[PDB]
Structure 1
Amino acid sequence: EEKVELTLDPDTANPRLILSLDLKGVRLGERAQDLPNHPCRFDTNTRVLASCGFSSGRHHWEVEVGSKDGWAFGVARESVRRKGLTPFTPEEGVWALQLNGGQYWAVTSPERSPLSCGHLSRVRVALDLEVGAVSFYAVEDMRHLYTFRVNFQERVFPLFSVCSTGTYLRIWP
């Protein structure tokens, strides 16, 4: 495995997202800003990717999470569709945990998988492109939250999404 230092890619970010100056934190603003046009920019779903993706090996990072509904995070295949409304599902190229309806989910499809995992504050995401897995652990005790098994066929990026104005995600040092 290998610890990675990530920064958010502001050209992928939906123009409603508010990114911290240091490119670690993301929240949802009210209304879009007039940001420059790029094919990589999510124009409808409230998503942003890190600037660095991974094509081989094992990598991990940590994400600090808000306590209110609206976030989801994990990884996305590079080919995830950027223009138009997409489903937030594995078949559309996102593998993520989510806080929605007051509880945590692994976003499996067609039915999400509810978790019983206490309160999440910081989460370790561990991407293994050797065996084909993405796993999530609560940092404070390394308790296993969920593993998706996927034999990835392309470059995979850290993924963050915030669809409600009262919460946040932050890449954590």
Structure 2
Amino acid sequence: KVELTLDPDTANPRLILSLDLKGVRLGERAQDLPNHPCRFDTNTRVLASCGFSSGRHHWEVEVGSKDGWAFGVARESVRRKGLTPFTPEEGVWALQLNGGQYWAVTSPERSPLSCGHLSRVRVALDLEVGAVSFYAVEDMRHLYTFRVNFQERVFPLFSVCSTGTYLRIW
């Protein structure tokens, strides 16, 4: 349904975006970019260039096998400057691969998923229902849903905090 690209102006300056602005990995060295207000200056995050205020949208995300990624959605007002917590209260609703386990990033304790190995995941954002849902593409098996009372523009969110993993809008 939606054709997203990663917004380079939002990306932490250590992130490396592929030529087509669909893939993201982490570099060791910070690239020299202007510190625009929208840019995440500390946490390893990037948003898509397009966000959603209403309706039902979906996209798919190819995921690395190694630890260090999280993705889902973020409210537009998610803090860009400073070190932020990666939590629903701070405006991020995401799955994560960390410690060899898949998680829904619930607070104050993350929720472990029993879903087996993931390769590509569909993200379904419904702003009339008030939910963001994740499915393993191979059989559209439901992984997790956050129900949320979204009341602003919601952006696709990606984060990569290890040099050994990646995400790709696919």
Same fold, TM-score > 0.5, yes or no: yes
2: CA distance, partners of 1:69 / 1:148:
22
SS state of the match for residue 89, structure 2?
A: helix
Does the residue aligned with 2:72 lie in a helix, a strand or coil? strand
Give, in whole Å, the separation in 2 of the partners of 1:56 and 1:151: 12
Once the two structures are TM-superposed, the CA of residue 109 in structure 1 deviates from its matched residue by 0.4
Q: TM-score, normalised by structure 1?
A: 0.98
How far off is 1:37 after superposition?
A: 2.2
Distance 2:148 2:113 in 1: 20
Measured in 2, the distance between the counterparts of 1:153 and 1:111 equals: 25
Which runs of 5 or more residues in structure 2 are unaligned?
none
Separation (CA, whole Å) in 2 of partners of 1:5 and 1:108 = 28
Q: Secondary structure at the match of 2:122?
A: strand
C-alpha distance in structure 2 between counterparts of 1:112 and 1:85, whole Å: 19
Distance 2:109 2:53 in 1: 29
Alpha-carbon distance in structure 1 between the residues aligned to 2:129 and 2:141: 21
Aligned to 1:60: 58
TM-score (norm 2): 0.99
Alignment partner, residue 42 of structure 1: 40
Within 2, Cα distance between the matches of 1:28 and 1:158?
Answer: 18
Q: Percent identity?
A: 100
**Quick one: distance in 1 between partners of 2:3 and 2:61?**
11
Q: Deviations over 1:62-86 (max 9, x none)?
A: 0000000000000000000000000
1:96 CA displacement: 0.1
Paired residue secondary structure (2:138): coil
- Structure 1 residue 107, shift from structure 2 partner: 0.1
2:35 and 2:41 in contact (8 A); partners too: no
Flag as ranges the 4+ runs of structure 1 deviating above 2 A: none
Q: Name the CA distance, whole Å, in 1 between partners of 2:58 and 2:34.
A: 31
The separation in 2 between residues aligned to 1:102 and 1:135, in whole angstroms, is 22
The count of corresponding residues between Structure 1 and Structure 2 is 170
In the alignment, the residues of structure 2 paired with residue 143 and residue 31 of structure 1 have an alpha-carbon distance, to the nearest angstrom, of 38
CA distance in 2, matches of 1:36, 1:170: 24
**CA distance in structure 2 between the partners assigned to 1:70 and 1:23 by the alignment:** 19
Alpha-carbon offset, residue 31 of structure 1: 1.5
Contact 2:70–2:97 under 8 Å retained in 1: yes
- Paired with 2:98 and 2:82, the residues of 1 have a C-alpha distance of 22
Whether 2:129 is the aligned partner of 1:137: answer no
